[model samples]
Target chain A: RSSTGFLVKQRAFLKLYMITMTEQERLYGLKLLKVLQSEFKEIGFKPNHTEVYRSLHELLDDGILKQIEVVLYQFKDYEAAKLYKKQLKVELDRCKKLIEKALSDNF
Target chain B: STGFLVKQRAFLKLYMITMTEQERLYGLKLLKVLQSEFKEIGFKPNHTEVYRSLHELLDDGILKQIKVKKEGQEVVLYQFKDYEAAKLYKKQLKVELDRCKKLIEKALSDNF
Candidate 1:
């Protein structure tokens, strides 16, 4: 069985996703959660509501993301957040290729 | 001043330092090795993260690469750019590791 822990990776991915999204537009937690669920699904991961919220909470804690308090949900882009998002994007891409290789090799 | 990158920075620092102790490694092989390592520790690091770290190390002058042919296909192999520099970086890595520990402690206590 593959032992890739979900919470840490999920939070890392979500932080990047949120930063990328906020660069284009702002998002509330519920909206972010829905988008995250869909994106996570695309990658074959299913994130429950609690998982999504917890990931967001961690992102907020790390200061790469922020809550706007408008409509009881919102996020802003952190100027310093760009570097980590860029780095995360690179890591995610490598992992994606690795996953594909493992699947192809197994098949 | 910190984010997930802080964790990644610490990890890559140690990874490269340890890597310097061995022979050079193929990029793909390194990724597979890292994935397994994370798995053992209940942390999942995907291919992108591994490759990105490698690239960042190369860019940072922490690692150097060489081209080699494998099975008639050209591939890149990597090693520490400076073994001495890696040793120094490893020493500084202790601070980052300590910071990570405190963060983990805070998370545990705050979450509980």
Candidate 2:
């Protein structure tokens, strides 16, 4: 996950996560950023918020991770999809650190 | 000789672990700066972990509980019966990491 790359090494990390991530997980990332920015008023960190997001863009390029807006068009409220949005916001935040640590620690 | 078997209660203590110090310091400082950081995201570390860490490092003496009253928030505090014991627990976190590494290595090797 910490391979040598641009300004931030997070690119590799996001890429791998996106590759294996479930569709539900992808949208959750977006929702997370939204709440983090709007409701929380937290935009960036010491390294700058945009930097973290650009790292995520690398993930989207892989076709693994995507916005829910894409799938929302089709699924349109199947049982799992219904809960996906809220869960993504809540559960994703709940597990973000643990997930990050687990991913990095493994490799 | 009579069979003298003694029963003993086995105790296995677990420790709560977090990210590496460098990663944590950087990420947390960033989160705090960003203001998006939530209590649930990371440990309450900056507030108390530092004191706990140093206290554990020193003599491991009796812990003095201080009431940290956050205006609208719940009252959070510390409880360390033995500073040395707490310190041991802190050091044990490092030991736990080493144990995890060994286990992962063994599992990979054994699977093949």
Candidate 3:
């Protein structure tokens, strides 16, 4: 069935364009992906399970959406690293420990 | 579990079974599709930008990174130019034009 596009193919294209957003990337992780997938019917598109995953990865890889890192430490009042000379060194060491612990699953 | 629900269910079934190719795109249409599919996602890329970006991607030889910077400030983003031939300059535009035509034809033929 390599004949350019069949009914199934056209349906998929319409489904992807009409349903997929220009901002929200990936379906399984983000709540927005499912919401948009749900809304596809209104616009004449379908959301394949695999395609949903692929779309998210593509968007994330291209930097369309920033990666969702699960931060353990909550830095509420932190300023930019360039401006904060004194606080920067303290935060840097603290952040490194947190990152290491998270990577090692010690957190 | 209503009227639109029924219609949506049917559509979802179709999507799950449909076979799709060209999952990843690059060069000119890269930004355009990204913009249309994911608005405010990245910078808008032009022909010269695309050419330079693709050239560098091939030099890297790995499609790992799809972004190139101009003058250390401007970011020219792109996708798969790895599989593309070096001769295909601004080929995405031609590809897009063809896609549009095919879409138009499909719409017309399916209408009646």
Candidate 4:
């Protein structure tokens, strides 16, 4: 089910959003659910809380998040997160480009 | 979960477009376009997921299908229901796509 895929598919996007939200809200990893519920309601769209936990948990385990931290944690070695996200940017942009290509080109 | 849609999921629609842009298009063209991007995106492409995405779109009423009868079998051809459908989905996907980019940027900005 690719719709299920959509749920898990945008892990990078979802995880990134969670991190930024945490930064802004100063909430611990588990605390985001309560906070985002308000935002979600504000948007008139409630999200699946359980899967949201998995994403934030994965971010915590992935070393992107840390306990008792001041955003000091960083990916080590090949700087994979940076490169992964950079490629993510490329992947996303290419998607937009091609979609617009489909829209304008030969249509 | 609540608001949206976009890897295999992404190309599936645009392929539906480039393909329906003309029925002269075939799976090979769709596959070529898909595998080309799938490769670039670090994904291994498959025909089955496209089948899955096509059906999912149909189920969501995002796409309309033409089932042509061939003997006992009905061959399914996928399509956007209208230009409005096509254009709006394009716009919708832009939201998901940019959300992806903006997410990446946010992570990059704060990751250090």
Q: Which candidate achieves the best DockQ against the true structure? A: 4
lDDT, candidates in the order shown: 0.55, 0.33, 0.33, 0.52
All DockQ scores:
0.05, 0.03, 0.02, 0.15
Write out the backbone clash pairs for model 1: A91-B48, A91-B49, A94-B47, A94-B48, A95-B46, A95-B47, A95-B48
Task: Give interface RMSD for all predictions.
Answer: 14.2, 19.6, 21.3, 5.9
Better of 2 and 3 by DockQ: 2
Evaluate model 4 with DockQ and give the value. Answer: 0.15
User: Second chain of candidate 2: TM-score?
Assistant: 0.34
Chain B of candidate 4 achieves a TM-score of 0.59
Tens digit of lDDT per residue, candidate 2, span B2-39? 00000000000111112222222221233243223324
Q: lDDT of candidate 2?
A: 0.33
**TM-score for chain B of each model, two decimals:** 0.68, 0.34, 0.25, 0.59
Error of 1 at B94 (Å): 1.6
Model 4: how far residue B17 lies from native, Å: 4.1
When 2 and 3 are scored with TM-score, the better candidate is: 2
C-alpha RMSD values across all candidates: 14.8, 19.2, 22.7, 7.2
lDDT of 1 by residue, A1-107 (tens): 11124323646655555665666665565576676666544223455777667766766776656655443323444556766655654455455444333323322
Q: In angstroms, how far off is B21's CA in candidate 2?
A: 12
Task: State how far residue B28 of model 1 sits from its true place (Å).
Answer: 4.2
Strongest candidate by lDDT: 1
